Structure 1
């Protein structure tokens, strides 16, 4: 199943472009990859018993690639689920709890509707120009 356009044989949406950008920036807060892959029962005994809805950055990346996010709010919800899971399974004295708390706070600030509107407004002048 193909189509021909602009001299190229073919077959990335705005939301995919936005979420790919924010996911790369959030994963930079986790240089050791603690949040990069699903938590296994081997590394975290009882995890599958305690945490009913697991989430990780790698699973969110798969959702972006497959174009399964319909809103920023859905992305932020998955992000929040990951951080809440880490702050439920792990004790407050752990790197996982402390990092989840920092990531959750920083991510919600960075992706607020009000902030994205202000960034869009700052960029609008380039769309008003003809080049």
Structure 2
């Protein structure tokens, strides 16, 4: 098996804007999750060669990871905070799709997802 190229993280032609939500998504949400004890499997694209997962990209057609999300936020790749929230949810659900209920890695994603939901609950929407 061979990996796909990572998701795009930079497009010089896309319009750029900074919002309080995007700022919070990067400075608080991504930062908090990145430092979580369970973060390390999700900090870069799944390397199915290095991890000996030859069917991963046969099953996962929309890969996503927090290293990509970090780059997207940093490059002003997102226009809407919802695009970022969706990438986080793609990352969590990818793990659920590839693995099985009760798997350790699925419990780890579930814990990260709970933390994620607690943090976006406090998203600044002009407070």
Q: Report the TM-score when normalising by structure 1.
A: 0.70
SS in structure 1 of the partner of residue 117 of structure 2: helix
2:118 match: 109
Are residues 1:58 and 2:67 paired?
Answer: yes
Correspondence for 2:18:
13
Q: Deviations over 1:5-51 (max 9, x none)?
A: xxxxxxx9344432222101111224561100111222122011000
Structure 1 or 2, whichever has the larger Rg, is 1
Could you tell me which runs of 5 or more consecutive residues in structure 2 were left unpaired when the two chains were aligned. 1-16
Whole-angstrom distance in 2 between the partners of 1:92 and 1:50: 16
Would you tell me which structure has more strand in proportion to its own residues?
1
Write 1 or 2 for the structure with the bigger share of helix. 1
- CA contact under 8 A between 1:50 and 1:89: conserved in structure 2? yes
Q: Which has the higher contact order (CA 8 A, sep 6+)?
A: 2
1:28 to 32, 35, 38: 35
TM-score, length basis structure 2? 0.72
Q: CA RMSD in A?
A: 2.2
1:84 aligns with 2:93: yes
Tell me which stretches of 4 or more aligned residues in structure 1 moved more than 6 Å. none
